[PDB]
Design a protein around this ligand. Sequence first.
Ligand SMILES: O=P(O)(O)Cc1ccccc1
Length: 146
Amino acid sequence: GFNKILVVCVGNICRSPTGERVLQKLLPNKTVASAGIAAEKSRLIGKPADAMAIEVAKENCVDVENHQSQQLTSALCSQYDLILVMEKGHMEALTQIAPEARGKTMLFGQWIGQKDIPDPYRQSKEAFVHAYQLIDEAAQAWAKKL
Ligand SMILES: O=P(O)(O)Cc1ccccc1
């Protein structure tokens, strides 16, 4: 039984808050949160989701308001049943932080051909559109399996 899901990216301002809120809307009886591998080093802790990420999600009827970026820690990992990373490369960075969490760590895009979800940060709204499309397709697949 996977009830608590942690969506992980690097800053926790773009992809991972979007994935959190998209999955949360699809799985209302589950607890979905998100965290960033380098949120602390990037000085992003407490920051809201990127304005374009909020805007694009809003246009797809998903609320990414009231988000606060947080750092991924071993303690945080122990609280969640399933961990979903945005890129395959994030796994090595995750294991460095929480080696014990590798067993429950999977790819957000696992069921859509194990696709990595590209970072739209610092780019135009079109890049955020692209990322949302992939996150949406990926989350819809996870929801069918959970
Ligand atoms: O939260 P994301 O989607 O990784 C965007 C981002 C945020 C900070 C540093 C790099 C990339």
